[PDB]
Design a protein around this nucleic acid. Sequence first.
DNA 1: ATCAGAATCCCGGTGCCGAGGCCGCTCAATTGGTCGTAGACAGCTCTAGCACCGCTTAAACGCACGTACGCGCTGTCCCCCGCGTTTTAACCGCCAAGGGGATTACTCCCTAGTCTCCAGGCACGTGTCAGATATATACATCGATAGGC
DNA 2: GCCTATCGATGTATATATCTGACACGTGCCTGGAGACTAGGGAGTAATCCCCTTGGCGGTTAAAACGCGGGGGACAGCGCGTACGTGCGTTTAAGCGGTGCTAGAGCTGTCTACGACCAATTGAGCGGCCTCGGCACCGGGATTCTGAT
Lengths: 459, 95, 94, 87, 83, 97, 98, 105, 104
Amino acid sequence: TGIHLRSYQLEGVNWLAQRFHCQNGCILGDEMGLGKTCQTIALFIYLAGRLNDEGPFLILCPLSVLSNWKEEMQRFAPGLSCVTYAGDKEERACLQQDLKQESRFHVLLTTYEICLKDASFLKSFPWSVLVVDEAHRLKNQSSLLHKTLSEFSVVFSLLLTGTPIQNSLQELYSLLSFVEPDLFSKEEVGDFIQRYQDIEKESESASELHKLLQPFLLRRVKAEVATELPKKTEVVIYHGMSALQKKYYKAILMKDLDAFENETAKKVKLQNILSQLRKCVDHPYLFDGVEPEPFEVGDHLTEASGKLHLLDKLLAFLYSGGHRVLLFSQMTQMLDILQDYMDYRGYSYERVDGSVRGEERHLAIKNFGQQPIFVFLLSTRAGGVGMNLTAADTVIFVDSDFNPQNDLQAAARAHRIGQNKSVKVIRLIGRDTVEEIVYRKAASKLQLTNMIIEGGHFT
Amino acid sequence: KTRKESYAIYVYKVLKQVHPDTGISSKAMSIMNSFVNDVFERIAGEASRLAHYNKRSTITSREIQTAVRLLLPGELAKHAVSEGTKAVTKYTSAK
Amino acid sequence: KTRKESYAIYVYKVLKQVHPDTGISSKAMSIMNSFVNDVFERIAGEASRLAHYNKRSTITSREIQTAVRLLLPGELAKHAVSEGTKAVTKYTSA
Amino acid sequence: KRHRKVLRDNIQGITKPAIRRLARRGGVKRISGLIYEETRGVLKVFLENVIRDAVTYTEHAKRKTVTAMDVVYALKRQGRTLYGFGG
Amino acid sequence: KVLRDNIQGITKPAIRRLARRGGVKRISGLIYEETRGVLKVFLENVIRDAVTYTEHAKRKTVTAMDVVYALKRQGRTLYGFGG
Amino acid sequence: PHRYRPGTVALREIRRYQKSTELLIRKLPFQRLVREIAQDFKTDLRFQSSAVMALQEASEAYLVALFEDTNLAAIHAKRVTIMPKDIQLARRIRGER
Amino acid sequence: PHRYRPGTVALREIRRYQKSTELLIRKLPFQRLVREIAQDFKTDLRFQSSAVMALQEASEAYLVALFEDTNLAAIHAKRVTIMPKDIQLARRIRGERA
Amino acid sequence: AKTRSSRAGLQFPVGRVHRLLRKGNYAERVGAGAPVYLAAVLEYLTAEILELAGNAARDNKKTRIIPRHLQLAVRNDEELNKLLGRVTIAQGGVLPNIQSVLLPK
Amino acid sequence: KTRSSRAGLQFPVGRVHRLLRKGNYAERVGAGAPVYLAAVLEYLTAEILELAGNAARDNKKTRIIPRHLQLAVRNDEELNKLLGRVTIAQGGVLPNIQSVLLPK
DNA sequence: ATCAGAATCCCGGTGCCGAGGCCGCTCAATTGGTCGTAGACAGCTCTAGCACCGCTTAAACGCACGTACGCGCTGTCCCCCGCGTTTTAACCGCCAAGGGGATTACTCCCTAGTCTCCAGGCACGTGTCAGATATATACATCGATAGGC
DNA sequence: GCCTATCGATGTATATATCTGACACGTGCCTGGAGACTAGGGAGTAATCCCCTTGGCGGTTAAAACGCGGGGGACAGCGCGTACGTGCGTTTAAGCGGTGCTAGAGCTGTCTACGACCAATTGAGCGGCCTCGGCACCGGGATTCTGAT
């Protein structure tokens, strides 16, 4: 016993227990959020406190979520001895004596880079089960993480995801074979492509795919869970370009002038085009030297980018409407420019970014709760995962993405373990630019993938 | 009575273009002949290697041109290249 | 799939004569292969000039011998000339 | 405060300890402080002479990648034969 | 019909003339025997090759061309003879 | 407190690096220098990784050999400290310009 | 009793021999030396007259160049008198003294 | 025997050498004895280096030859160091050497 | 009718073409190669002879002699680069004295 | 010191032999033609080169302190330079042998060329042990203390 | 004032153990080396010519060899103070594991413009011969540098 939330969590624990009673690893792919941590804690107390197996447990998760995993365990299962292997080399060395030589823990909390660097210590333990959070990292069969983790002595493995498969069948068999390689090595040897006839079985033997996966993978859908039903309406805004960036966009398609050398938009390199075009439509001061004086402060910053012209207007509107917002960026320097605008406006903000430390991330999260911070500045990658951000009313994708599931993952920072209010999602598009092409290409990937991933248990 | 060809007459014709009043001594002609032969070997040697590295059977004006740019310094190369392309243009324009 | 060729197997068989029970790393094998090509071109180049200075059409073993005399250091040349002479006089008897 | 960040000039990326570390392999015990700028000049002159030839081969072949053979041929032409990358 | 000793024919004042053309103002008395050593080593290496070309041609007479080819092979070069 | 005297540690470093086979310049800084110099000769060039690596092997070998001759010039002048005049003398006598 | 002071006429010699073009070694002594060295490699060689001249021109040019680099090495040590240690340094830095 | 190398008693490939001489533009005609003589010399020099490298690896207590051992082998022999006087070997390093003036007293 | 005339050169294009064939430089020789090469040799010859003529005139001699060729080469950086390892018979040297050696 | 006295330019004159032109002719460059292959172009595949984020951790950096090295100054003395005299043999002009290099006509053996054939060398896939990495020793050098002797 | 220890602090070499990827090795295939058989011209050979190298001689001079005085430079010793080596605490960015894109290297197939080869024809340039003036060399002037006062 320890906590209660939602009725479907019981049948999840029963299915998990049944898979381990069948003595195999398994994948849990219930929708983004839905309390997979809660069901994992329930599994641990079932093992330790009904089956009475207390062999050591290993948990791997991203850096941005470690403190949340501590808290939820320390809330809901105080009876389990849980410790965290983190810190400097000298600190982690001391913890070898303090913990690994002393054997007083049920559970380790860890993160991937640490377990890759200190792997030889983790090999020494016969683990009861391995839990991998945000398992998409294991989609690639070249990865050293999948090699090392598949080599550990564990009784069973559990992989957690908010959405299995990001692109294609090779990701599926990679994830699937790394759970039970004796059953599925032929798949990663490549036979499964042939067996499912390169997805040219998508409707001709869909039932074959469903019957392959459903005994082995559980996945339940948020529209099926429904319950509170806050809406998630998305709108797309198309916008042009100001004259400065119009000149440079054409120049990038052609050649730069020596005026652009004094503005230093040449002496920068041209060996890739797509990156430079995206910068140009997003903001020309992403190029070095293009802002005419380094001491400049003023609303010209909002004029040099069409996106910023709309965003300034939209943020002023939303702020006047009292709505709080999350901004996701693909680029670090774009967050820097945006924060300069927040400083110029004097808006209340917080920031999470790959350079931000673990404590600072925890502090920032607690700071964005508890009080009306207007806006959160987030990297799409480091900020996209795990966290509760129900405090926001709205989400803006300032820049597009090559994979739609990255946006879905970011949007799911709301609604995990419920949300109180409807939320709007706003996408900004550079009209008649390469940004439209990337958007259309990305959408095409999703339109393929759903025919597989709406199968399985959901059928 | 035995025959031995040399560059001597062509060197003298060029001399009379740049300095009509000047003459040249026999020892100096021997040096000039040596110089022409030495430069010929250097350029032809590089042109040969360039064709070999590219698996090409034929030596062509391209090989001469890039051999020149590898061997000569600085502006001396720039003038030499300009003279070559000019001469070939005239020759192929004529027939 | 595009076929190359190299001296590697011949170097390897010579190694097993001078020292059995030893091996060679692939990096070292690449250096050995490069060295053989260098020495080949030095000798063949000088043999070409020797033929040209004497107005001969044909490269012969006598050109190769004189090229070796010019290129190699003073004693390393003497053994090499012996090995070359020994090989030819054996071959012609077959 | 954050709009832009300075960058150090690329030749200064040949750091002071890196030069000392080279000089120690040369057996140099004690080093006067003027030598670091002197050495950077000498190195830059060397690279320019090799790269100019290497690019000349690449362009004659009508490629756009510079290739390891181009460097080897440039080094050989300048009398500094390198073993280990080709033949 | 046998030659000996005549390396000492490269006299002291002859060596000074070479040093003067080189711009040397003062000469320590040890330089002379050091110089004669260096000269003898140079000649031996050139003459070795010139004879080698002569034997290949089956000639008995060493020619100006044999010297010029020997010098060129050593990476020196001499304009104004042969060629 | 404890200290080694001046020059005691320098001798250790000589013995270490003469025994080592490592490359001594950081790769990524050196790569930027090469890719910059090329822009004077052609506006846009890609590089094979092995091409950059060959340039570093040649460059470090050249500098090491130069420091040996530089050291002899300093000793000949009865110093122990090498100075820029020693580099200039070495390059002049080798005929480098 | 008139004497020029030391080093003055030494400069006049430099100005003279840098302006002249003549060969500076005595010819018959040099020819004997050439024939003596060849005597080790083959017996009863004969020489074309111009072959001996070519050897002398090359040899003299070599030594004159060597004395220049030797002079630099002496000045580097803040001396003005050349000494054998200077020659040994010059040939080492050139890479001749293998 | 079929192969010309085995008539000569060589290990190196006489036929491959003969082909390269024909293709290389070294001359208009190639006499039948020249490949045999050239192959023998290349084989000799190969054996000469590998013996010295083998000793160095054995002295260094390792069974595989690596580039360091080739550098040590070449630079310690007066004739090989003259033949390879202007060649640089990748991953070679240098010989240990310190001038006596620098040593402490 | 001569190819030299047709190209406007003084140097002998026909002779150059024969030498490219006989020298074993390659299997096959294109028609443009000798014309280009002859032009370069003519250029370099004119470049040296101009400077040598000036040196002779400075020396008040009407005929060029090897001394004038040496002075012409060694005073030009690019020719001295090209001929850095060549010795010219009867050339002598450039006049030069180190400043340290001069009297006070 | 301004002056004497060596030693460098500058000049007009004499004459020698090398540079410059010319002639006759022969052999190699030109013209006009045929043949068949090298390489110029179009199309295609998919390797690998460029770009960015995220994160750890050793290297680089900035500073304080003290030493020993680089340097300028001085005094000693010995070894080089400048010069006059004596001795050597290099040079030059002439003669004269005959060894050897250079050319010719001739005959032959060796090489390039062609077609047929098959096994030596290559690209590939595999198993295992030589070397890399840990770490717990052992043991030589470098100093300060500061003995003594 | 050495010089002999003394401890002891530190850095390097050694030994035993575990684990991993690069190296030797076996396999199927194919394309390039071996085995015939042929044509013709590059080379070896004997004979001849006559150019050039070697060798010797006598005369005259320029140059080398030898002795001397003395002054300038090489050298060792000394005192100064600066700059560069060693060690510490703080800050930076190099390195690596990912993610994704598509430019462009590498290959195949076609076909036609080009260069090799040939015979007939012609004049460019070569060797031999002749002549005149650019330069060498000479006697003797003027100019300008040294160095002792």
